[PDB]
RNA sequence: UUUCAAGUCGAUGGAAGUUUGAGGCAAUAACAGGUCUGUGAUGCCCUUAGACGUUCUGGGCCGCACGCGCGCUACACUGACGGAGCCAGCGAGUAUAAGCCUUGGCCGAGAGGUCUGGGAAAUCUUGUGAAACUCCGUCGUGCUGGGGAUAGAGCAUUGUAAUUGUUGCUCUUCAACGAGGAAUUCCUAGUAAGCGCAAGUCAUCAGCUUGCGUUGAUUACGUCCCUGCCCUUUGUACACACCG
């Protein structure tokens, strides 16, 4: 049933950039979970996020990535 | 897919092993043949063959030039059915041992390259109820 | 600086960058096709620097020992081998690629045949490594 | 003729090729050290050979 | 064939035999003022045979272990090939065989 | 290397050798479902196209899908090695040959009579539908 | 110089610790202990350094030579190495009084600092896969 | 605590305080338990020249509507792959053979081939650079990149001989299985569980045993409730002893 998002539509992109940063954690899962992306997707999201600024990385690890909010 | 593309033609079709045609499959010597064959075959000439094998293609030889009015060529019986069949003995008719009884085969030429003990099974098939 | 003083696991992605930026390596044609060990199940996933990235393994490899062959090469990255049923087992890697490896990196430098067997690391191959570990630690 | 063919299958590299010193068996051949004797051969000789049990 | 560096490999299964021949040989070695090297202690060789205890094939799974440790001791002597053989009939053991190198 | 978006380019399916293909698969395993192309198979295919991995089925254009069927046509001219190939030394013409959807099961097929038709061992044990390399079937395959 | 020479050990792993006078150099097979690749582990070997403060490896340096046992074994036997170097170190060349300090901080956090593991691997026995385990009985 | 006894439970010291851990040996008798398919160990019966002796050739012990037991892979994300990191121990090894362990170099995508050299061995294979494992990436809950049966085609090794594929490798084919009812097994510390490696069988073949090491726990440290055995009392018309 989960039949999750892997393109990335310009509807659903301004509405990441105006949900992420309104979360206490975001991890791959929470990406996955909450924005119905693919976990793919997410991953890319995550390492460009932190690049822009809007994202703080809190722990690196290949398996889990653990980003809060940067405000 | 690009297209889909169905010619075909009627090239006036004869049996063909291996890019070989049965008019210049037959006129080979076994040393040229075994090299357009499988991996199984060209090991086993190469590791030398006894002087069984080379004894039964003799006799077979002979039994095709008993009857000249090309009728079936008479049978040489044999044990050894770890034979490969080669184009040379096509048409040829064999009894393999199969442990009891003398199974009779007809050289097919789709047959070549297969041991010639593989078309005579050796156990009576299981039958329940 | 040496490179027993840097890690191994990113002195490697910065020997990988200047081999494939310095261009001299000579890569065989078939490193976009082979798979790297017969244990393996697909080919590698950087078919672009896989090879890069496996030479600068090697030398980092053979700098820390003395007269390292090829065939212990195939035995240090084989791994265990996916039999279906029957229990795994390890299975060492092709000896193409790590023979071709060490004979590309022998006209581009860094190893020479050693006596009594292997590949010593050469009089220009400490030289130009101990510098790669420097330009790796700055940041 | 018959010199030829008696005794004529290679008997080498098999189970059949080798025996025991003792009983001449093929079967539970201990091959290890060069002992060439069956398994039940070597226990009743272990200890003339010089193999003890100690652990 | 005078002075000769030479090495005596003492292999056997008992050690009482082989100490005292060791020491003996050893013991030798010192009145006599040869300099020497030993007795070197090589790793010990334990030859294992596991066998089931069934000449038959019933029962529960039991197996004897069988053992059959080889100590190796070699002992360096500087000394000519003369006088190093005659120390060796000096320290004749039934149990003990010698083979010497140089 | 970043996110990016598109509109109306995507093509959720795809028909490719009249074989139905589901767009939002990534290229190398998407070929997968298209018989006669493994996981091993589709990730030279698309390396030896110039497409990069990295794409989803439905995000190729038709230039490159054009180009990946031309080569799975035509795999020996593009430095595809004979030994990866499907059918390699073919039995009637001895050239090497990559069967492929619509061409697989017919020449299986003809492999399977033509092992009844010379009626060897192997064929009748096919034709039973039992283990035909010498498996034991005393106590292992007995469903249906 | 001021050389002492010691060993930890764990399952199979044995490390010899060699202890010198000198500026603070502290090796773990020719590589500083900063790089040690059992990284979730890097604490263990850090537990020796931070509980009695590093000013105290200022006129020592250490090279360890780790060989045998298994990637976590190894880890075991290099802490106990560098803890025991320590010790015999001032009960040579300083005070015994410094000595029994130093002794003291480190019992009272862990015995295995000192004391090596005693535990090794029981014989496997016949009837079963393992020490204890048995293959699976049927009626 | 205790009959202040045998002991038990806690600490401290200690390498070790469960008989320090683990085994080897192991009583008085006994079983119609299993083996004459280990014996040039055997009594007797059968056969002994058209052999039931021995040998050659080929097949079978693998044969398949089915029930059961010892096991191996798995059913995924605490994971699969792709790269990178890279640590053991127990052992074995040959000559004029009938061919041992085989590094190093050179060919091959692999399997493997070839040329030299070391080792009768703490010397060389070998630090057996093993696998789980760790790091960085792809995958993203999908019978999916889990799983790899079944099958087609092709390439090598051993062997006189591979067909009923010995085994290995390449591509393709990619099935049940989405954690398993009633029942039932093993196990208390470097133990269980994984994870590989060596030795035995072995010309070739280990999903098997015998050991070894790597990572490494949860939970009792109690009871006779189930099950088996031992002891005492008891009944007996049994003593070839309840298979009475
Ligand atoms: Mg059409
Ligand atoms: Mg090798
Ligand atoms: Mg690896
Ligand atoms: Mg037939
Ligand atoms: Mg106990
Ligand atoms: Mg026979
Ligand atoms: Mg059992
Ligand atoms: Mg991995
Ligand atoms: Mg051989
Ligand atoms: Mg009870
Ligand atoms: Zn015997």
């Given at each position: 049933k989960a039949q999750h998002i892997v393109i990335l539509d310009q509807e659903k992109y301004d509405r990441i950039l105006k949900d992420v940063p309104t979360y206490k954690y975001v991890s791959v899962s929470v990406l996955v979970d909450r924005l119905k992306i693919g976990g793919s997707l997410a991953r890319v999201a995550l390492r460009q996020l932190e690049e822009d600024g809007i994202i703080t990385p809190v722990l690196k690890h290949s398996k889990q990535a653990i980003y809060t909010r940067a405000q | 897919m690009v297209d889909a593309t169905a010619p075909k033609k009627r090239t006036f079709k004869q049996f063909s092993f291996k890019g070989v045609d049965l008019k210049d499959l037959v006129e080979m010597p076994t040393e040229e043949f075994?090299?357009?064959?499988?991996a199984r075959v060209r090991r086993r000439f190469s590791r030398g063959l006894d002087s069984k094998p080379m004894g039964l293609i003799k006799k077979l030889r002979a039994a095709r030039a008993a009857t000249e009015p090309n009728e079936r060529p008479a049978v040489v019986k044999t044990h050894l059915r770890n034979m490969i069949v080669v184009p040379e003995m096509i048409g040829s008719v064999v009894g393999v041992y199969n442990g009891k009884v003398f199974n009779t085969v007809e050289i097919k030429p789709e047959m070549v390259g297969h041991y010639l003990g593989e078309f005579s099974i050796t156990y009576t098939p299981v039958r329940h109820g | 600086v040496s490179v027993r003083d840097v890690p191994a696991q990113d002195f490697i992605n910065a020997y990988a960058q200047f081999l494939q930026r310095q261009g001299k390596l000579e890569v065989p044609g078939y490193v976009d096709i082979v798979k790297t060990s017969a244990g393996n199940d697909l080919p590698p996933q950087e078919a672009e620097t896989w090879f890069y990235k496996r030479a600068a393994s090697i030398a980092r490899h053979i700098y820390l020992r003395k007269q390292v062959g090829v065939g212990a090469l195939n035995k240090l990255y084989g791994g265990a081998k996916n039999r279906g049923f029957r229990p795994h087992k390890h299975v060492d890697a092709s000896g193409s690629i790590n023979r071709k490896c060490v004979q590309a990196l022998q006209k581009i430098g860094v190893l020479e045949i050693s006596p009594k067997g292997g590949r010593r690391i050469s009089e220009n191959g400490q030289r130009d490594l101990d510098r790669i570990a420097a330009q790796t630690l700055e940041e | 003729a018959h010199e030829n063919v008696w005794f004529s299958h290679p008997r080498n590299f098999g189970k059949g090729s080798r025996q025991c010193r003792h009983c001449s068996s093929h079967s539970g051949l201990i091959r290890k050290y060069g002992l060439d004797l069956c398994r039940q051969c070597f226990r009743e000789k272990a200890a003339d050979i010089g193999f003890n049990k100690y652990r | 064939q005078q002075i000769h560096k030479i090495r005596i490999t003492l292999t056997s299964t008992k050690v009482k035999q082989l100490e005292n021949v060791s020491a003996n040989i050893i013991r030798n070695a010192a009145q006599y003022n040869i300099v020497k090297k030993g007795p070197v202690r090589m790793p010990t060789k334990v030859l294992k045979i596991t066998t089931r205890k069934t000449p038959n094939g019933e029962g529960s799974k039991t197996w004897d272990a069988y053992e059959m440790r080889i100590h190796k001791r070699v002992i360096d002597l500087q000394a000519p090939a003369s006088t190093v053989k005659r120390i060796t009939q000096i320290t004749i053991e039934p149990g003990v065989d010698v083979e010497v190198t140089i | 290397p970043l996110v990016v978006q598109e509109q109306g380019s995507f093509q959720h399916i795809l028909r490719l050798l009249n074989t139905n293909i589901d767009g939002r698969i990534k290229i190398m395993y998407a070929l997968t479902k298209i018989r006669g192309v493994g996981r091993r198979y589709a990730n030279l295919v698309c390396k030896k196209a110039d497409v990069e991995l990295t794409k989803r089925a439905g995000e190729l254009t038709q230039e490159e899908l054009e180009r990946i069927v031309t080569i799975m046509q035509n795999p020996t001219n593009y430095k595809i090695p004979a030994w990866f190939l499907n059918r390699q030394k073919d039995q009637v013409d001895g050239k090497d040959y990559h069967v492929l959807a619509n061409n697989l099961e017919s020449k299986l097929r003809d492999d399977l009579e033509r092992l009844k038709k010379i009626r060897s061992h192997r064929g009748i044990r096919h034709f039973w539908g039992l283990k035909v390399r010498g498996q034991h079937t005393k106590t292992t395959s007995r469903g249906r | 110089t001021q050389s002492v020479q010691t060993f930890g050990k764990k399952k199979t792993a044995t490390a010899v610790a060699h202890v010198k006078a000198g500026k603070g150099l502290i090796k773990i097979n020719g590589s500083p202990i900063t790089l040690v690749q059992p990284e979730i582990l890097r604490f263990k070997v850090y537990e020796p350094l931070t509980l009695v403060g590093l000013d105290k490896f200022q006129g020592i340096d250490i090279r360890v030579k780790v060989t045998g046992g298994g990637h976590v074994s190894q880890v075991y036997a290099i802490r106990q190495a560098i803890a025991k170097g320590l010790v015999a170190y001032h009960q040579k060349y300083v005070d015994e009084a410094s000595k029994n300090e130093l002794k003291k901080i480190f019992a009272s956090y862990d015995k295995t600092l000192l004391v090596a593991d005693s535990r090794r691997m029981e014989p496997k026995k016949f009837g079963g896969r393992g020490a204890r385990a048995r293959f699976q009985k049927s009626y």
């Open positions: - | 075994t090299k357009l064959c499988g | - | - | - | - | -």
